From Swiss-Prot:
Phenotype upon changing residue 8 to A: Found in a lung cancer sample; more sensitive to gefitinib than wild-type
PTM entry text: Phosphorylated on Tyr residues in response to EGF. Dephosphorylation by PTPRJ prevents endocytosis and stabilizes the receptor at the plasma membrane. Dephosphorylated by PTPN1 and PTPN2. Monoubiquitinated and polyubiquitinated upon EGF stimulation; which does not affect tyrosine kinase activity or signaling capacity but may play a role in lysosomal targeting. Polyubiquitin linkage is mainly through 'Lys-63', but linkage through 'Lys-48', 'Lys-11' and 'Lys-29' also occurs. Deubiquitination by OTUD7B prevents degradation. Ubiquitinated by RNF115 and RNF126. Ubiquitinated by ZNRF1 or CBL at different lysines in response to EGF stimulation; leading to recruitment of the ESCRT machinery and subsequent degradation in the lysosomes.
Effect of residue 268 to A: Reduced phosphorylation
Gene name for this UniProt entry: EGFR
Outcome reported for the amino acid change (mutating residue 163 to Q): Found in a lung cancer sample; constitutively activated kinase with higher levels of basal autophosphorylation; more sensitive to gefitinib than wild-type
Consequence of changing residue 46 to F: Found in a lung cancer sample
Protein's name according to its UniProt entry: Epidermal growth factor receptor
Effect in UniProt of substituting residue 135 to V: Found in a lung cancer sample; more sensitive to gefitinib than wild-type
Effect of residue 18 to C: Found in a lung cancer sample
Organism of origin: Homo sapiens
């Protein structure tokens, strides 16, 4: 609804936060047009000439990403603006703790059951909000969940796949791998893989198995193994996210209720060394 087109003089890039095939993420500073205030931002500069869309069609996709701020949800990121030159530059408020994937890997022996279950609730609340806005994410993963504070996570990169036109096979539902079908139920599958990443403290799903063999392995009934800290109650919820029939998978609304019940008594559902305080 409110997409701000930023001029290159309004914002400055200070340092690189991370790189990749997608492009680069910078920690920067923004001074809005009719304002006298410095705002700490994160700038995602995408790789030039990847997408065949003209600047007008790129703007339409960015408008949709910006519309998500209305009415809004605390667990979904906010696109502050877009800068279109030879590359696409996306601007958001800086999340100082980075993504949830790096956070759980770096803080493994200090994360208790209360944290893991509350993050699952928060991710389902943000995903359920995107489903309310009729928006399919297409790339939900622990790398796409940002940490504002350890007790407040937000989903990022929604609509970024549609803007662009390595495929994340190990997070995709079987119907997305075989037919490129993307729905809110295929996002439920990716949510299950994201919960599995958190419960394993950042383990790589199907490690060693080539991406070309994932579809046949799923057709044989093989799923991600039960993480050591999970009880059968938690594992059964991730297992239901990985059903062949998309309509039989739980809804984000139901996942909020299930994980919310577990977060009320977390030591009963997750067994972690260090929670015996
Ligand atoms: C493990 C950390 C990691 O992998 N990061 C990747 C990443 N992306 C961003 C990021 C994302 C966006 C963006 C793209 N699409 N939308 C929205 F949904 F429409 C957004 C908000 C962006 F505009 C800038 C951007 F930097 N970050 C990041 C890093 C720090 N603070 C915020 N975002 C990361 C980290």
């Amino acid at each position: 609804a409110l997409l701000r087109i930023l001029k290159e003089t309004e914002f400055k890039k200070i340092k690189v936060l991370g790189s990749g095939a997608f492009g680069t993420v910078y920690k920067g500073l923004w001074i809005p047009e009719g304002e006298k205030v410095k705002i700490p931002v994160a700038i995602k500069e995408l790789r030039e000439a990847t997408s065949p869309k003209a600047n007008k069609e790129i703007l339409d996709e960015a408008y949709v990403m910006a519309s998500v701020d209305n009415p809004g949800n605390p667990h979904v990121c906010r696109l502050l603006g877009i800068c279109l030159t030879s590359t696409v530059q996306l601007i958001t408020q800086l999340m100082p703790f980075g993504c949830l994937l790096d956070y759980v890997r770096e803080h493994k022996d200090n994360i208790g059951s209360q944290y893991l279950l509350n993050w699952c609730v928060q991710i389902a609340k943000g995903m359920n909000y995107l489903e309310d806005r009729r928006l399919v994410h297409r790339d939900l993963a622990a790398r796409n969940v940002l940490v504002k504070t350890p007790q407040h996570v937000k989903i990022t990169d929604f609509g970024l796949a549609k803007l662009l036109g390595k495929v994340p096979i190990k997070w995709m539902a079987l119907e997305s791998i075989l037919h490129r079908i993307y729905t809110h139920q295929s996002d439920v599958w990716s949510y299950g893989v994201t919960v599995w990443e958190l419960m394993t403290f950042g383990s790589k799903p199907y490690d060693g198995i080539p991406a070309s063999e994932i579809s046949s392995i799923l057709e044989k009934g093989e799923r991600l193994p039960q993480p050591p800290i999970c009880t059968i109650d938690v594992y059964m919820i991730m297992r239901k996210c990985w059903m062949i029939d998309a309509d039989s998978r739980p809804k984000f609304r139901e996942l909020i209720i299930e994980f919310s019940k577990m977060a009320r008594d977390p030591q009963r559902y997750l067994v972690i060394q260090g929670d015996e305080r």
